[PDB]
Write a protein that binds this ligand. Sequence first.
Ligand code: HEM
Ligand code: HEM
Lengths: 715, 715
Amino acid sequence: MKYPVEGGGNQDWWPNRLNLKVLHQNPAVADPMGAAFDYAAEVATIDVDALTRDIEEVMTTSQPWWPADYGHYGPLFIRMAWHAAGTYRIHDGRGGAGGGMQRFAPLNSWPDNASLDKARRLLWPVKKKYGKKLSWADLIVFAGNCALESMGFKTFGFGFGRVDQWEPDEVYWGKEATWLGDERYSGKRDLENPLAAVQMGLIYVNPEGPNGNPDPMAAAVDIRETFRRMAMNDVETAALIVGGHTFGKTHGAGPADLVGPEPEAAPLEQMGLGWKSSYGTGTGKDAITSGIEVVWTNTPTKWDNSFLEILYGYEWELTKSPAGAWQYTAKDGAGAGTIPDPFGGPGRSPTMLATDLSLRVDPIYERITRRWLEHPEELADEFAKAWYKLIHRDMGPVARYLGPLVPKQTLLWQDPVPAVSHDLVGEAEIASLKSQIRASGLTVSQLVSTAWAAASSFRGSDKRGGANGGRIRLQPQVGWEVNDPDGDLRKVIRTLEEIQESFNSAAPGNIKVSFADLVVLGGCAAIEKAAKAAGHNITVPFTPGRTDASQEQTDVESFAVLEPKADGFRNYLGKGNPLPAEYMLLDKANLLTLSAPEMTVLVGGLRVLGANYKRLPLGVFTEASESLTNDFFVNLLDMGITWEPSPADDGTYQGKDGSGKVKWTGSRVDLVFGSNSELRALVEVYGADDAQPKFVQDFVAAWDKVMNLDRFDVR
Amino acid sequence: MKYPVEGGGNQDWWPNRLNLKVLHQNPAVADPMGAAFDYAAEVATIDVDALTRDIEEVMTTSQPWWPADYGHYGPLFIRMAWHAAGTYRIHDGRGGAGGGMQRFAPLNSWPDNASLDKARRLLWPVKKKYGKKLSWADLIVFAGNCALESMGFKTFGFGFGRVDQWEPDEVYWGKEATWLGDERYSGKRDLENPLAAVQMGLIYVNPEGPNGNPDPMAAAVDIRETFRRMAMNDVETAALIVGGHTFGKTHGAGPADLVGPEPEAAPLEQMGLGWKSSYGTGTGKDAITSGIEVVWTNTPTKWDNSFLEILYGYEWELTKSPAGAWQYTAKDGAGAGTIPDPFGGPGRSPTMLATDLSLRVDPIYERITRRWLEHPEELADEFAKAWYKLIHRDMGPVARYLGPLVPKQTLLWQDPVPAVSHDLVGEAEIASLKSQIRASGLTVSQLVSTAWAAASSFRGSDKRGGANGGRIRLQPQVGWEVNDPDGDLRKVIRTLEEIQESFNSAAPGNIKVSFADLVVLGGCAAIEKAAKAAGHNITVPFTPGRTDASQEQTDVESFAVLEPKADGFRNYLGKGNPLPAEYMLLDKANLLTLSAPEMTVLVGGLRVLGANYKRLPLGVFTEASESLTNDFFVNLLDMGITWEPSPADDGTYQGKDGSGKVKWTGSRVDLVFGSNSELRALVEVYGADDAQPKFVQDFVAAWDKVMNLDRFDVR
Ligand code: HEM
Ligand code: HEM
């Protein structure tokens, strides 16, 4: 129907086709910085004090195209940073401030991100000045952090290092094709996974209550659940809301239908800005953002205990903003004129959101916030910790945090591991340990499977998971179904621990090896063995330095979200997946940061290596198991085999030869490689007569990539 | 509405948004071959005689899942190769066999490409054997070439060198969202540009006549026009049809509604094959492809003059195939039983397509084909030339043609240039000529604009155009509006020719310089001057070796399709473009093979260098013209400027300062860089305080890329 330059493509003819473009997000060709650019090296040299002073100058210098409430952009920047981090969700680790995605579609145009187009624009002078040394990603959340400090709140600390991207991360935000739409609930009030907001285009909850019903008790149910899905418990949630609403104000001075198109739908002359309003001046005193007109505190540009003092110091009744939005105001005309106007007008009455009232109406929040009414030093502590968590939740390993403001204190939510406390294994010890593991009696399948299980727990969205920590032997990973706890896992763990004990006791010097490094090294040693069995003498690369986490360092509930409900690389498909197995394969590959060729070699290799869940024969298209051949690709392309869905409709297929005898069995994941025209092209590379050496090389490179995914300690 | 893995994206919320993804087609990460892979080096080593023998073995070994008509797959392979090349169109140079796109969506599933899924599958044994030394792209057309040779037709020659791609080239094939749909005609019978087929999913024309009306006279109008739009004249078109239909047969043994979904819509177990039929065996004697049941000649697997002898030797009446398709059969039961059955059945009567009858009904085709009736040696000659042209139209410069079968004869359609006949300019002569050109009195704008005009005529679709040939001084390029023939062009040409004369007559030795090299060197010398003026001492790279074409080597009407109706890099917008200027910019950048960063740096640089069409001030956001600064990017991000559409709605905009005074003017092309969220990210890179050196470096690299686009003689 359309030109490709206007978005036309093959999805128009086959709407539900597998989208392999999820495996080439942020292509190098789109990146203007060049091959040698290293943001970490750039931002490590930034003048943080000068940056802070420059941001402070921006916050207190009102611009005429978006005048600053109370002459201070601080609170606007706090909402900006909070919204940047607030898209994060635990189910897939996507969203968050990590890539500065708020500057791009669709997030830059979400109803809830109204006016943040101007907020980000205000900071161009800072980005202009610091250039390569400062990403928009870092700047957006640092501006929030500076705002807090500028207004009297001492933060816990700050880590730089968020890398800017050049195209939007494509994320599933829900099925609704209407802004603020809601088709994401089933049962009593079960919110659709992986979502963490109650309506399309909201950060968490509706500020007017569920579906616009301003019931604070019902609103709190939504607040609790959505914040839970963004890694915040009851104390953290309460801390963040009171901490945030200690500052600034909402904007709803006139009717919302006088507000123009969002940035992505706006005319060219608006230069990336949207929501142009025809109500009065359209800015400042006349500003409309949410459509609500609330100023929570008498000190909108100062940290103090005013929020809770006001919340508990008045009784509240339902009222309407100038734009017709529900909000609460103090009963009986109490506190008239006590709240300051953003541009020097007459004083105003106390006001709160329905969601603010949840904090005193909900029994759990009420106990927390009444305590803080009486002991505000506890609020300051909890808010510091929660805000720190909020703006860093998706940053991954602490090795990634850069700059002079990084606090010394490690935190449980960072999934910490011990520091390296001894000398690392060298070339000779690595060779020795590989030999010892091959002599241990552990099979190639066992070693490869275990190393895969450990390393493939990583997801590139929030950079959580991976083989560092040795968490495969700890809860919950040791009990995950896909890791098959009733199988050989505990035997493999025990054997590797015995080798660790032996090596550490036996070897003098100061060299010690971690269980974590041994899990990975076992996989590498087995792949070497299997490659030789296929007539290839290769060494699989290995980088030592992983350390062993304790159970105490491993939050079992937090780690729960990392459990695969599907892993096509092990031909595992559990219940509850939103899409057929082949789609879940690409999703898994996306999270592992794999390209299509990398995904392809890994599937083919792991199948013939025996890495399958429960050592099932599905996709094991070889006569020589435990040997690293390209047999999977050769057999998949064999026209002497006729494929048919299994008589038992179990998601499997039978591959029959000319006599009608079943030679192979496969899953949807297996067959998609021969059926999908773009994947088949890749299979035809690795299935050619000249391809075995290349396959082995590419498999080993891809394997090494997966083993090293969380290794920011050596990067 | 959908998961990204199922195709969901930002186009869903903003349907008509600029799709920057056209500037990162074939990303490196999707390519399984690796950085060092060199197809030219691999195919240079193939045993072409052994390859030919292996293809011949494939053609004569019937496979039971698609039995070979007459025991020979040759004619099926001719149709396959012909369809592979037959998507080509002159208006943008897109389509053609150049990238093996028939193996991917949407082409692999076009109604007209039915059964070619089996045709390509038959050749896997060959691809399997030769591997990296043989692309599918080369193999598909070479199989067609071999087919002809094996059945008694001596071809003109063959060039290898078509590189395989890993994702489909996304091309505009029409508006229609129904297969065989037709919404591409206006006026009397004006076909929509850039299209070269009469209905969606057809190669050229409907074999049953226009819109299924079997009028041979009307059909010829469609044949003439579509073939013209694929670079074939009347003789070539007639030669191709006669030559092709000398072989094989159509397939329509039963009703077409018994034919299953096309490959891209078919079930996984079919392993990339589609159109599975439940009519009888679904293959062989029961095969249905087009729905027509025609065998044109009594010798379907042999080259001879039987097609024209049959066409003219019988009278023809309208009939219907078993599938209900219009076709023609000999009148009065003449020639009963004279045509052989593909699988040894009873003989059949002579039959023809409505479009075959066009060849004797249309007055022009009738004169051509009646001649060949008596002079078949002329048919053989013309078909050899036309088939060669067909299979190589999109190959670009003859330097790209590889292997032992490339004929010596140069052809006009290949846009030939003389060989280098003397020694090339070295480092000293280059430096000397740069100095001479700067002393010549030609301005920076003149030199940069002329070199751009010449080089940017290149399109990466069929690799036609570019600065080699020096065709800027020849018809039609010298008269193109965008090149501004009334402006300084002729003056620049004359000056550079005088410098060429002077250098060639003055310098002794064996060194001579072409006008073509001087056009480009002038641009390079001027950008050096302009960089110096902005405080940068840089050398712009330059590679000599371009030669000078004569007007006789320059087909004026063939070159007509290379004329830009839009060039955003020069802020030129002519009439007749299908989309707004910013979309045409991206299309132009795609054809120049430019990334978004490269496009961005080029626009900013060319503006401040004065390269604009008619030296218009649109987008010239600088106080210092003819100096190479990043002023374009700095000023585009200036919030002190308010942009508004010009009072005269002429597609321009006014940028007013705080006083209300117009400081800048810009087009849609200029403003899209500040308006588009993804492009603005790129301008914020080159607009930063630290960005001048990087801008200059990146501009020079991108400039050098464009100057070198057609230079396959040095790669
Ligand atoms: C139940 C959760 C929350 C709800 C329903 C909510 C709702 C809102 C709404 C409707 C606005 C007005 C936007 C406008 O019209 O300008 C607002 C503003 C604001 N929010 Fe929240 N919010 C929540 C949590 C938070 C959190 C966690 C923070 C940060 C820690 C925060 C910080 C702010 C700040 C500082 C403003 C004032 C912005 C300005 O002065 O322009 N909020 N909030
Ligand atoms: C006016 C232009 C043309 C039209 C309308 C046309 C139409 C057709 C149709 C409908 C078929 C039947 C496909 C099937 O049912 O299996 C066919 C087959 C074929 N075409 Fe054409 N064609 C055209 C030009 C050409 C050209 C230019 C060539 C090659 C130079 C060619 C070579 C062939 C061959 C060799 C077959 C037989 C394939 C087989 O035996 O399986 N055709 N054509």
